[PDB]
Amino acid sequence: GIFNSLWFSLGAFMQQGCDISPRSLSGRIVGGVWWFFTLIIISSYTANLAAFLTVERMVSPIESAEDLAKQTEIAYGTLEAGSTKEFFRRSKIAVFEKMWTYMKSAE
Amino acid sequence: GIFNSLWFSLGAFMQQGCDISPRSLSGRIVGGVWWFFTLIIISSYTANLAAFLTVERMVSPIESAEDLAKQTEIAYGTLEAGSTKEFFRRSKIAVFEKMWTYMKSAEPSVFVRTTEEGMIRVRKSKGKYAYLLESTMNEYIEQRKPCDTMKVGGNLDSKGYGIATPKGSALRGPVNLAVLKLSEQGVLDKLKSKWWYDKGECGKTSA
Amino acid sequence: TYIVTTILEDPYVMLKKNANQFEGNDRYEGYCVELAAEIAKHVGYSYRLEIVSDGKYGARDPDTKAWNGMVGELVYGRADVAVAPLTITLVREEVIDFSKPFMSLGISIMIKKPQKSKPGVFSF
Amino acid sequence: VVVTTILESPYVMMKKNHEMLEGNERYEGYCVDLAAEIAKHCGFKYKLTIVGDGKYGARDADTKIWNGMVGELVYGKADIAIAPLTITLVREEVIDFSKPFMSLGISIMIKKPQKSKPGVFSFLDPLAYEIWMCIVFAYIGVSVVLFLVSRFSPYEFGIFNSLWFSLGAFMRQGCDISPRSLSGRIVGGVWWFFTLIIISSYTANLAAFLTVERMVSPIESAEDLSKQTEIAYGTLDSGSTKEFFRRSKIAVFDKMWTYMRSAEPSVFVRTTAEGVARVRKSKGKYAYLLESTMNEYIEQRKPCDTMKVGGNLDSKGYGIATPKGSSLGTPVNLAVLKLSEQGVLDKLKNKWWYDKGECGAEKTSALSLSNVAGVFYILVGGLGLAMLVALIEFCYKSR
Ligand SMILES: NS(=O)(=O)c1cc2c(cc1Cl)N[C@H]([C@H]1C[C@H]3C=C[C@@H]1C3)NS2(=O)=O
Ligand SMILES: NS(=O)(=O)c1cc2c(cc1Cl)N[C@H]([C@H]1C[C@H]3C=C[C@@H]1C3)NS2(=O)=O
Known about the structure:
The PDB classes it as membrane protein. Chain A is mostly helical and 107 residues long.
């Protein structure tokens, strides 16, 4: 009937059993193709769920000072009239020198 | 019976169906605990199979020259009486200086006499030895049977061979023009392709 | 005539399997040998295949200040030209004329490839 | 002396504050860094001049005149030259040269074809078609074997119900019938084991093959490119690439040079940026043949709307030039040897290239419907087929 048809279709999408099965050719085609569809979809869902559960936390691209300085799309600066500004003024390392050059003049 | 019992137990381990099911309590306990066991085992197998299929290839710890030098458990040296040895003698970079200091005095002599000698030395060693060599002969022999040698890392520096000639010789200009003509024509590429690739002694997502 | 210094290394200079049967320049067949043949055809100069007795490459010791190997034969007049693998560099170029390159190269690391267990039939 | 540059990037990068600078500090680049590094070891005065013609030496057949870069050195207008200048015989027959300080080669350049979404029938990729064919014929063989076993050795299992059972067991959905004999139960058991293994192998890594997108280039290489004619390729005008194709004697290069020469309009171009713009304003109908260095530099720079296909057709090396007979030829040669021995060249090349790569300097995301539409199409086709078949059977049994 229709009630049992819905029951069977649902019992095959969840991969559980089915107290009945189609007996004619024209119902068996439908059953088989529905089984193929649910196999594909359920395997996809399960795999992508596995992927989501072990999903790495958002790794921001600002992890390093060198990376934070090369990322000119994000502007950066040091507090003015402070000891940190003085340090970057006298900073001699490559990354600090480049950051100081970038921050010397920016609007 | 026993035949159907085996059939049912097998039909529940493969997660397929079962034309029958236990009807008493004492068979239902067994059925349920067997279902729990097969669930655990099959899930474990499937997950670890997924892991194996997307298994990363063996990443040798000799990827970098600095790593290959810090790994003193593996000895390394440069061919003696050669230009590479001279380069490492005059090498000024930190990694090269450290490698040169390590290779200056080591027993047995990390240096070698001939290229075949170094090849066999690395061959016999159970991975406890490393060797420095030009990027042409290395590939050529890595292509030759036995193919038990394998290059790791990339070229450390770019250089080139050359058709030498006595200083003040009269065959200097002609040879330069000759090599230029031979390089412009595909003759030289043809030679290299024929006598390096035509031999072929041995040999994340993917279907 | 021309005297040529080859280091006899695989595959730049190779001795023909019929070494005893073969004789002369035709006896030797290597990439260096074929290059020598091609360049000679380009210029037309007689030459005789030869190999350095010392079996060494350019290495000028500090104490003696003497060149050995193919470069040694070249500097002292023993060898006329050197069509062989010879890494062109500064100290060597300071004494001997280099023509323009004919092959790029680089130093590299070699290791005994660990055996990887190829999945057998029953890898599942 | 006088140092001449080509005003070509990244070898000549005009400084951003061009207004407030003059002299050797006008512009920046790898070429200027090398010029300073060599002036350190050579002790020769130089001026950062630029050639007026803005092009490299070419030898016209009729006038037999060197133009631009080579003309300056040959005709005394220049004393030295430091630039991305390519060596070659004809150019070397007129001026002394130095040793190479870079490796390169003629390379192709095109516009990045868009990322082709995994097409319909992407759910078969996880398994190679060989395995799919073996699976089909094993599903046939098992059902045939079960039919034979049951019919001729009974305790029903025809062929139709046998195929039904085998299919149901392959998809983990059991059926209403199970074999009752030993000879059918062995078949069922091996079928269950086989399907378990295959499904566990397939299921695993199935989102990737439904989500991964791989770009397919139209021009695989020079041979494939020259075989076709729908897409037009071009090259710089009055340069080493034109001279290389002109003197070519190889069949592919001969036909390629014939096609480029006999193509209207002229595929050629006055300057590199012109070719860049042409490929980036041609809907992927233009392919430009430039070196392997500029190509990579462009690839690393935004918007990164281009890519390199194939491998270098030939390696040439650059080289510092010098007028024939100039006393400066030897010291510059030894200087470049020394710098190569030092890490100056490798350091400069590694730093300048990939210094500011905007693009690229994977995540798991849900499945869109575009990725899994094929199975919906297949389902709907199956339903239509089932209704058609039932109507056919209905009419047939009516008669
Ligand atoms: N195929 S390859 O990389 O080994 C290679 C490498 C080189 C070749 C030719 C080949 Cl086939 N010739 C060039 C020379 C040709 C002319 C141009 C540079 C020199 C002079 N040098 S190279 O860059 O060292
Ligand atoms: N940056 S690179 O790998 O392309 C590269 C390539 C080359 C460099 C230096 C660098 Cl950094 N110098 C060599 C020269 C140096 C001496 C050795 C060969 C020539 C002469 N030619 S090269 O092989 O063309």
